[PDB]
Design a protein around this ligand. Structure first.
Ligand SMILES: [Fe+3]
Length: 52
């Protein structure tokens, strides 16, 4: 359940929530996000995220 944070805008990727609008069901670990996943708030790449 490791939380990751967008270094661009501060949005938190919370695996317990997932990201349904990008086809990411609740419980999806950060490292199981596709590399084309983007921050919902600011649009930055997955690879702009760091562990909280
Ligand atoms: Fe962001």
């Amino acid at each position: 359940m490791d939380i990751y944070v967008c270094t661009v805008c501060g949005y938190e990727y919370d695996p317990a929530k997932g990201d349904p609008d990008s086809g990411i069901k609740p419980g999806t670990k950060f490292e199981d996000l596709p590399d084309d996943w983007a921050c919902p708030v600011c649009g930055a790449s997955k690879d702009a995220f760091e562990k909280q």
